[PDB]
């Protein structure tokens, strides 16, 4: 065996305040994989160093024959809970490498090129919480006057938004302004906005 185990990963996007779960498929021509390590480029062959500390991983049934074939690939779970204080800007990504060893000691090669992304090399992209959610079209709340929404009227718009969006975090704050504009403030303090014309109407015309 002169061929190392091959890896197919993916575009791993994660969000602040949310759990994530991705899987990579590892195959080898020997049909067996004895070890899987996910790590930073820096370090020696033996380096297991992986940052950020909240990125966890596990692989079941390691070191067993036929655990990494084309018909039934070895699966590696890449999971964790992104903290709320993680930094996001526009270059908020960590390029990491998946290294697996077959019984011969052959290890997946780490090549520093963007054309390998989604194979042994993957990009973990950390985004704000708001990017995970796309607010659904909620039921229209008919109000008395579009300039002048009352406190109960604004409470009814928040609730309608909540009714049409059950997936949004229970602790996310939905607030409505005097003219009906909706602001969803997630646990990490990012925000989405819904224009008033999509959620409130009156019969003043
Ligand atoms: C200490 C040292 O010498 N290490 C170098 C390492 O710096 C150097 O560059 C790293 O190469 C990898 C590719 O293997 C990436 O290109 C790293 O760049 C980026 C990344 O993609 O990960 C950009 C991103 O903008 C940065 N993220 C944030 C949030 O800032 C990350 C991030 O700094 C690191 O991931 C943190 O661990 O870096 C790049 O830095 C490589 C080869 O270029 O050589 C090692 O010896
Ligand atoms: Na092999
Ligand atoms: Na969004």
UniProtKB/Swiss-Prot annotation:
It is found in: Secreted, Cell wall. The lineage of its organism: Bacteria, Bacillati, Bacillota, Bacilli, Lactobacillales. Belongs to the serine-rich repeat protein (SRRP) family. The gene is hsa. Has a short (SR1) and long (SR22) Ser-rich region separated by 2 non-repeats regions (NR1 and NR2). SR2 is comprised of 113 inexact repeats of SASTSASVSASE. SR2 is thought to extend about 0.2 um away from the cell surface. SR1, NR2 and SR2 are essential for Hsa-mediated hemagglutination and for binding to sialoglycoconjugates (fetuin and NeuAc-alpha-2-3Gal-beta-1-4(Glc)-HSA); removal of the N- or C-terminus of SR2 (residues 448-1459 or 1092-2143 respectively) still allows binding and hemagglutination. Disruption phenotype: Loss of bacterial-mediated red blood cell hemagglutination, no bacterial adhesion to glycoconjugates with alpha-2-3 sialic acid termini. No longer aggregates human platelets. Bacteria no longer bind human fetuin. Bacteria bind less well to human platelets. Triple sspA-sspB-hsa deletion no longer causes human platelet aggregation; a single hsa deletion aggregates platelets normally. Significantly reduced binding to human glycocalicin (GP1BA, the shed form of platelet glycoprotein Ib alpha). No change in platelet spreading on S.gordonii. The protein is glycosylated in vivo; constructs without SR1 and SR2 are not glycosylated. This is Streptococcal hemagglutinin. It comes from Streptococcus gordonii (strain Challis / ATCC 35105 / BCRC 15272 / CH1 / DL1 / V288). Disulfide bonds: none annotated. A cell wall protein involved with PadA in host cell interactions required for colonization and pathogensis. Mediates hemagglutination and adherence to ghst glycoproteins. Recognizes fetuin-A (AHSG), a highly glycosylated human plasma protein, also involved in recognition of human platelets, probably via platelet glycoprotein Ib alpha (GP1BA). Acts in concert with PadA to promote binding to glycosylated human fibronectin (FN1) and vitronectin (VTN), and biofilm formation. Plays a major role in fibronectin and vitronectin binding; binding is mediated by glycosylated regions. Residues 1-205 are annotated as: Non-repeat region 2 (NR2). S.gordonii, a commensal oral cavity bacteria, is among the bacteria most frequently identified as being the primary etiological agents of subacute infective endocarditis (found in 13% of cases).
């Amino acid at each position: 065996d002169t061929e190392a185990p091959q890896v197919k990963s993916g575009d791993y996007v994660v969000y602040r305040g949310e759990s994530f779960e991705y899987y990579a498929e590892i195959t080898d021509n020997s049909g067996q994989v004895n070890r899987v390590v996910i790590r930073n480029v820096e370090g020696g062959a033996n380096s297991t160093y992986l940052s950020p500390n909240w990125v966890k991983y596990s692989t079941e049934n390691l070191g067993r024959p036929g655990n990494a074939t084309v018909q039934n690939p070895l699966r590696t779970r890449i999971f964790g809970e992104v903290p709320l204080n993680e930094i996001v800007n526009e270059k908020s990504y960590y390029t990491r490498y998946i290294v697996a060893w077959d019984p011969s000691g052959n290890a997946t090669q780490m090549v520093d090129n963007a054309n390998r992304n989604g194979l042994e090399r993957f990009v973990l992209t950390v985004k704000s919480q708001n990017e995970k959610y796309d607010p659904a079209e909620s039921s229209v709340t008919y109000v008395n006057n579009l300039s002048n929404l009352s406190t109960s009227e604004r409470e009814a718009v928040a609730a309608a938004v909540r009714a049409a969006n059950p997936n949004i975090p229970p602790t996310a704050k939905i607030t409505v302004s005097q003219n009906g504009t909706v602001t969803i403030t997630y646990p990490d303090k990012s925000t989405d906005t819904i224009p008033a014309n999509r959620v409130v109407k009156d019969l003043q015309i």
